[PDB]
Design a protein around this ligand. Structure first.
Ligand SMILES: COc1cccc(CC(=O)Nc2nc(-c3ccncc3)cs2)c1
Ligand SMILES: COc1cccc(CC(=O)Nc2nc(-c3ccncc3)cs2)c1
Lengths: 390, 393
């Protein structure tokens, strides 16, 4: 029907999950205006006139929509592969957030992924206390910005480097990681890179996963067919490393590595060279050993080994409930169903809404195109602002 | 401004039918990009290939869901112009009857001229006057621009004039309606420039509406408009608009009154006052209006009409209407006992069309497609038409 058509077409500009919603549409025009404003291209009149026409309009759009200058940068709280994360304060709302910047130039220069796409979707729509939340996603001619809730507790790498983690704490953190990974698996994703670096702590000391750079969607039979290895050298599972066809079992390998590192102090397959770490991983059968540690309980050693085995015998091959049922978790302080409502082992004592004490101390683009390059095309639709899921 | 205000303002901008960035214009921008990039030479670039491959399934859905030409059943081609053809159509679903002006995108780009249609769209779309033909929908594709208007079954004034020796009483009515119609356009901030009987359309009731606002242009701070554009068929063109060629020339609304005088002349006399075989001869006669304007030796034209014709067929500086419409309105030619200016369109028109159906084309005379070459690099042929789409409610 004529009505049906205009209704169906209408829901398409509203749906935050739609490829053609106002957010993508605005981005698309904003992209064209950016990718064409060069003298060599402006020599063509169709181009010159189009730009000259939308000049006054596109600037209004640019000022009205979310821009980076809307945020006052408090401190650079982190640095990664393709950009930097920063504690910011939205100048108008005076609200405090953690903002992940991703250099559009850097990614384009042999990025090979489009990794930020599921990183956006997961954070934007997860709706889990276990996933860091995306409030706004916006861009410009140089970067991709992710405006997420700030985790003042810092990461697990910081906790571990400041405490000799008692088993009682390791139990809590491991358990929370199990709940957190399960949530991601339920969303249909395999995390592919579970490490302390991605474990973040809130105002209350409770866990959230961040940086789903490596996330991939599981197929019909809960598998991923990635022909190349993905992850971190110590936490990588041997199956992922060799590749390949694999399942969620790989994220449990990583849990075992994390449990080991917390209680032992080092990674189970650590070796001088990164190649030596790879070697030790492939020989997990004979390389996994425990020091003379009267502290590491029989159950913990069992759990570590139940996760640090070949995929086919891994704890978690038959689901989370077999991990949950493990005696290591048997305790009188929390129940799985209410674990995040219990009181954390390390409650952060914070000085302000901008206390950066749990984050270590910290502080070029594409050339002018000869012809049409379309450098801003692979980022059309990244904006999460005009049409969001409230 | 607050963050909230800033969000809300940006929201109203995707809703406003008067906005350059409302959802329909934005859809156009993407639709254009998809059309202007789907070529193998450009697809050699991955940024391009991936963008297209990504939006492929989406853009097709958009194409079928949005208003298309195949939504309309063409009844008869009711007209033909320079860059396309007008046609009486019936919307297949609603079964509603409209006039549809088609414009060839290839022809417009080919002939340099590709922007006249803007002021035509806006005027018809937003005028909201009984004097302006109404635009209900404006839509496009890789080949044409489409304007879906209300059908004027009464036909044009050129047809009326060719079928009747217009009595002065009728000419008074038609002239008066044209004055009200032009005033409405001027009020909107536009000068028509080349007014003529061809642009005077008659409704189901025989009342007037202006159409074909191609030559139309928006006035500046001082109610003036500057132009370079070479203008053909000078018969109704004012000597100031003719003088203006190359950008040398700023003129006002006074030029549309010149054309009224030409129309009043043609109705009562039977021919155009400056008609000559060649178009150059018509131009020559216009520039020499002072000595070329003459009336035939038959007592038939009334003194008032002659004065009015001459009051409009003078140099800009002394033209009736240089001091506003009220001085035209006050002219003795209009002095009558049949209508009042304030209620003229509520009166019973001199020629009421007797029509056979909702598709009666009796007042409209009886009536290879070149294609764009493939481009080695980015041509952007679709860009001058981004945002032409408009829907009503
Ligand atoms: C992929 O290239 C980068 C660029 C910058 C930083 C990183 C590491 C990273 O992904 N860092 C994240 N940090 C948070 C965070 C930090 C503090 N509070 C809440 C969330 C969420 S993801 C990777
Ligand atoms: C130069 O570009 C063209 C292309 C096709 C036709 C024309 C002439 C024209 O502009 N003709 C019009 N006719 C109506 C109309 C006719 C009947 N009923 C309602 C509207 C509105 S504009 C010009």
């Amino acid at each position: 029907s004529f009505e049906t058509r205009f209704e169906k077409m209408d829901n398409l500009l509203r749906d935050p999950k739609s490829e053609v919603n106002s957010d993508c549409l605005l981005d698309g025009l904003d992209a064209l205006v950016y990718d064409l404003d060069f003298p060599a291209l402006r020599k063509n009149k169709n181009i010159d006139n189009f730009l000259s026409r939308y000049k006054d309009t596109i600037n209004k759009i640019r000022d009205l929509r979310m821009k980076a200058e809307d945020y006052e940068v408090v401190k650079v709280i982190g640095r990664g592969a393709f950009g930097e994360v920063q504690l910011v304060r939205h100048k108008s709302t005076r609200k405090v957030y953690a903002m992940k910047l991703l250099s559009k130039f850097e990614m384009i220069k042999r990025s090979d992924s489009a990794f930020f796409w599921e990183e956006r979707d997961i954070m934007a729509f997860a709706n889990s206390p276990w996933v860091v939340q995306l409030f706004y996603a916006f861009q410009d001619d140089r970067y991709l910005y992710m405006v997420m809730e700030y985790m003042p507790g810092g990461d697990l790498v910081n906790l571990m480097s400041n405490y000799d983690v008692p088993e009682k704490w390791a139990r809590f953190y491991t358990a929370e990681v199990v709940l957190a990974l399960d949530a991601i698996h339920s969303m249909g994703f395999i995390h592919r890179d579970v490490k302390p670096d991605n474990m973040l702590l809130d105002k209350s000391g409770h866990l959230k996963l961040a940086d789903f750079g490596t996330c991939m969607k599981m197929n019909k039979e809960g598998m991923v067919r990635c022909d190349t290895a993905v992850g971190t050298p110590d936490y990588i599972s041997p199956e992922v490393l060799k590749s390949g066809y694999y399942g969620r079992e790989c994220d449990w390998w990583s849990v075992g590595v994390f449990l080991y590192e917390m209680l032992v102090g080092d990674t189970p397959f650590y070796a001088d060279s990164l190649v030596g770490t790879y070697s030790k991983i492939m020989n997990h059968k004979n390389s996994l050993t425990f020091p003379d540690d009267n502290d590491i309980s029989k159950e913990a050693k069992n759990l570590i080994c139940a996760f640090l085995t070949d995929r086919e015998v891994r704890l978690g091959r038959n689901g989370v409930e077999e991990i949950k049922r493990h005696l290591f978790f048997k305790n009188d302080q929390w129940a799985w169903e209410t674990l995040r409502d219990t009181v954390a082992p390390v409650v952060p004592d914070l000085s302000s809404d901008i206390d950066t004490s749990n984050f270590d101390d910290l502080e070029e683009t594409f050339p002018i195109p000869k012809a049409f390059v379309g450098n801003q095309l692979p980022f059309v639709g990244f904006t999460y602002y005009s049409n969001r899921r409230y």
